[PDB]
Amino acid sequence: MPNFFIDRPIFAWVIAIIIMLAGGLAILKLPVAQYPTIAPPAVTISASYPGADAKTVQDTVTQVIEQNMNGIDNLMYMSSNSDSTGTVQITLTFESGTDADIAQVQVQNKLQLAMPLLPQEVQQQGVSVEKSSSSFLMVVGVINTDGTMTQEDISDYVAANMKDAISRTSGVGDVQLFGSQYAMRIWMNPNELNKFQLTPVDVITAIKAQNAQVAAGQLGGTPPVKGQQLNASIIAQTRLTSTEEFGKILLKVNQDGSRVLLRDVAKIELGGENYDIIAEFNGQPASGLGIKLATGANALDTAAAIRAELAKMEPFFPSGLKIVYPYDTTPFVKISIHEVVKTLVEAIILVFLVMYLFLQNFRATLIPTIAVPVVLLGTFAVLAAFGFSINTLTMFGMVLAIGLLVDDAIVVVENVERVMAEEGLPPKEATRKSMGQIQGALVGIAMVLSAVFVPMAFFGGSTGAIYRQFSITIVSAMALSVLVALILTPALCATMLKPIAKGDHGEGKKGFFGWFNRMFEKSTHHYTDSVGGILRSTGRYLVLYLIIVVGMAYLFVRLPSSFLPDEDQGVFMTMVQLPAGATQERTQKVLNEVTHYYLTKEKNNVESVFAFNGFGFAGRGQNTGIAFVSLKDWADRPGEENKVEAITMRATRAFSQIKDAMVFAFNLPAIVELGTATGFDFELIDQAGLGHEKLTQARNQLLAEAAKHPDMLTSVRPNGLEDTPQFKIDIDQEKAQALGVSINDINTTLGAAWGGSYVNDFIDRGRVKKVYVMSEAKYRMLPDDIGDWYVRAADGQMVPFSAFSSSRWEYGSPRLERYNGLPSMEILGQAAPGKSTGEAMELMEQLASKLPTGVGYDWTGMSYQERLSGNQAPSLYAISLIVVFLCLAALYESWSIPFSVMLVVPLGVIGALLAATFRGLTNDVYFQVGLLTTIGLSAKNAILIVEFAKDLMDKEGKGLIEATLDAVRMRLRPILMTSLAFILGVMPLVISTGAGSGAQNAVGTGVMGGMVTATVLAIFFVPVFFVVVRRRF
C-alpha cells in the first residue's frame, strides 16, 4: 500500500486536506463543558401535610410511600426525611447511564398504588414527582440602590414580572424564588372582636360571600325563540381588586343601625406570603433567583441565554433597581478550558524543538510535524460522529498523545536517513526500501497501544464515565497516526529529501551541533562495550530485578487513596447553626458578625456576601442560616495563602470564638451534583429496632470518640437538628358540649388565629393572588396569650378559651431521616490537612466497630463512589495485561516473546510510584490512567529491540549475542529521541500552577515518573530478558 502513493504524491495531500477541514467544521459545532454527564440521575418526591408533627407525618405519609417503591429497575439507594413543618422529601438515585425519562415514568407508575391510602388532606394539597439536582447553576440577585422599597417589594416585582419569563427559555429546569408574591393579609385584633361579639369564623364566612365570582346565562340563549334579535352575556358579582374595597365588607349591623366593617376590627395590609425567609446582600435588603439547569443541557449555552434575557427587560425596571451576580460557576469553566489550550500549544512547541536538536535540517524536521495537525483535527471529527463533547478530560487525551504519536513518522524518517548515510541510495529508491523493514514495527506499536485502552471503556459506574473519555481520544488518535504516517510521510519524504553525501555525520556543523554529535557517538560506542559484559553472567542482574519487584510492592500499599481532587473555584459557602429554640432575631445577630468579618479582615480577597436567614441545609428552621461568598479574580490573588483552601482554614479557626453557635466554612465538592460539601459522607443506620433515644446515644458516643483524633479528622458535625421542647394544648370536648360551643368553631378559631388560613383569591393588576387571615403579632407570642381569645356559644355568650382547656410541655425531635427504609442519622466532616479522604474513611470504620450491637453503617453520596472505585481497581489491571499478552502473541508467532516483554512492565510502574511519593499525591482516578498509560509506553520501548533482534536472527543467521548487540547499537538513537520528546511534552502539566492546576498535576506527575525508569532501566534489562528466555527454549 505505501508503494502505491510514492508514485502518486498529489493524491496523498488530498486525503490530508479533507481530514483537516472535516475536523475544523466539527470544532465550530461541538458543545463545550467542564465534565461529561458523570452524575447519576435522581428523582425526587415532594408532599405536604400542614399542622402535623414530625413523628405523625413519618408514620402516615413517608412510610406508606416508600413501602411500595421496591422493585424498580437500576435502583442504587433511597433516602427520605420529614420535619415538623409537614413537608416530605423522598429522593431516589439510579445507576449511572439509566434513562432519566424512563425512570421518572416508572416511579410515577408505582406511586399511584399507594395514593388512595394517604390522608385526604395530602391528596387535596397535591404531590409531584420530577427530576432534580442538588446544586444551583447560578444565582441572580436583585437589590434596590436607594433603599426606597422594602424586601417584599423586591420579591414581588421579580416574582410577577421576571420569574415566569426566565423559565420560558431553554435549558432551565427549575427556578427557586427567594421571597414570595404579594398576598392580601388581614391582621385581626382579638380585643376588638370580643367587643362586637364576633369570632374569626364570622370573618371567614363574610369574605367567602363578598369576594366571589359567579356565572350567568346568555340573554339571547339557545335554543332561541323565533325572531330574537339580540345576544349578550349577563355579568354578575366579581372579585375585588384593592385594599380600599376590602374595607367596605360588612360584618354585622347593630340593633341601633350602627355598622361595623372589616376596616374597624382588623388592619388590612398588602404583604408577603411567607415571612420565614430573610435575604440580605452586603448588609442590604434583596431578593433573588435560584436557577438550576435541566438534565442533559449544556451549561455554557444556558448561561449565555440567561444573561442575554436579563438585558432585554432591564431598561423597563422601576428607578432604583439593578442586577447583581453573587454566585456563578461559568467563569471557572471558561478559564479552565482556556488554560489547557494554552498548555497544549506550549507542548507542541517543545516537541518541535527536541526534533531539531538531533542535527536535523529545517526541511527534515517538518516531515513529522504535519502529522500533528492532521491527527488532532481528525480526532475532533470522530468525537462529533459519536456525539461526545469537548471537555477537560478530552483535552488531556490529546495532550498525552502529542508526545506519543510522533514516533510513527520518526522511525520512518530516521531509518531512511540512516540508509542514505550508510548506502548513499537515491531518495526515491531509499524510501522504497525503508518501509519494508519497519512496516511490521509501525502496526505493532499502534495495535499494542490501542490494546491497553480498549477494555477500560466497558466498566460501569461514574468511574466508567471518566474512563470512556480517555479511551475514545487515545484510540482514535493512534489509529489515525499509523494511517497518516503510512499514507503521507513516505510520499512527501520521497522527493523532499535532497541528496546527501555518503558517510556524512556533520563533524563540522555549527554551534552545539559540532559538539553534540561527537559526545553522543562516543557515548554510543561506550554503551555497547558496557552491554557486552552484562551478557557474560545473568545471575547478578536477575537478583537486582527481584529487589525492584519487592520494592514496588512496598510502595504500592503505602499510598493513600482518594477520589477526584478539589479546585479553587472562586466561591465557597458558610453554614451557621444555633441551639434549639433560637428565635429569628438571634440568628440574624450572628449572621451580622459573620458578614462583618469578611468585609473587614478579608477585604483583599472577598467581593460580596449573600446571606440567608431561616433557609439552609439539614432542614428549614428559625435557628439555621447560610451565606454565599464570592471571591475576586484569580489574577488578583497571588500566592497560595490567598486561595480557597487557605482562606476557609483561617475562617473556621476564627469563628470558633462565637458563643452559643456552630459556624463552619468549606469548599464545594469535586462535582456539585452529588453532595453539598467536600469530604466524606457517613451514614449511621439502625437495623435492629433499637429506638430513637438509643440511636442518639450511639451517635453522640461515636462523634465524641472522633473528637479524640484531631490530627486526622476535622470539622466532624451532625447533619440534623437536635431535640426541642414542644407546647401542646389539651382540649376537653366534654365540657365544650355542656357550655354549647361547636367543636368546629374551636378548631377553626385556634387554627386561623395562630397558624393562619387560606380563604380566597383576588385580582391585582390582572394577576391572581391569595388572601390570608392571621392574628396580629403582639397577641400570639406567649402561652398566656390564649386567655385573650374568645369563642361564641350557641346561647350567644362569650366563653374564655381557658374555661375548657389546659396546657403542658413535652419533648420531641423536629426532624427524622430514613435510609433504605430504615431509621438513620447522617455524619459529615473533612480530612485533616496533609491527609487523604481514604485515610479518613479507613479510620472511621475502625471507630464504628466499637459501636453497640444492632447498629450498622453505610456510605452514601461522594463516599459511595470512592468505595466503588477502589473495589474494581484490581480487575482493571488483570484484564489489560491479558489482552496485551494475547495481542503480542498474534504479531510474533511465539509464546516466548510476550514473556520477555511482560517482565519489563514492573520497571515502569515503580517510576510512577516513586514520583507520586515525592510529590505527596494520592492514588486516585487520575492515577489509574497513569498506570494504564505506563503499561503501554513501557512495552513500546521493549518492542523496538525484540522485533529488530528477531529479524536479524532468523533472516541472517546471526548469533544470539551478536543479534542482541546489533539491535541495541542501531536502535539507541530512536529510543532517546522519542522518550525525550514525550518527557518534554508533559513538562507543562507538572509545572502548571494556575487556576484548576490540581487536576493537571495529578495526571502529569504519574506518567512522568514512568517514562524515566522505562528508559534508563529498560535499556539495560531488555537485552538480559531476551537472552534468558531464548536460552530456556
Residue numbers in the entry: 1 to 1033
Paper text:
Resistance nodulation and cell division (RND) efflux pumps are secondary active antiporters that are ubiquitous across all domains of life. As part of tripartite multidrug efflux systems in Gram-negative bacteria, they span the entire cell envelope and export a broad variety of structurally and chemically unrelated toxic substrates. During drug efflux, AcrB undergoes a functional rotation where each of the three protomers sequentially cycles through the conformational states loose (L), tight (T) and open (O). Substrates can enter the PD through several channels and bind to the access pocket (AP) in the L state and the deep binding pocket (DBP) in the T state.
To elucidate the conformation of AcrB without the crystallisation bias, we assessed the structure of the variants by cryo-EM. In contrast, V612F and V612W mainly showed particles in the T state (72.7 % and 83.9 %, respectively), with these variants displaying trimers predominantly in the TTO (54.9 % V612F, 44.1 % V612W) and TTT (31.8 % V612F, 53.8 % V612W) states. For V612F in SP-ND we found that all three states, L, T and O, were present, indicating that DDM binding is responsible for the absence of the L state in the detergent-solubilised samples. The T state remains, however, the most abundant state for V612F (53.1% T state in V612F in SP-ND vs 21.3% in the wildtype). Thus, the introduced substitution clearly shifts the equilibrium between the L and T states in favour of the T state. Moreover, the proximity of the bulky aromatic side chains in the hydrophobic cluster might introduce a steric hindrance for the rearrangements associated with the closing of the DBP required for the O and L state formations. Indeed, our structural models of the best resolved O monomer densities show that the DBP remains partially open in V612F/W structure. We assume that the O state conformation is still feasible due to compensating interactions, such as the PC1 and PC2 subdomain proximity, and PN1 subdomain interaction with the neighbouring protomer. Thus, the stabilisation of the T state DBP in its open form and impaired DBP closing are likely the reason behind the observed increased abundance of the T state on the expense of the L state in the V612F variant.
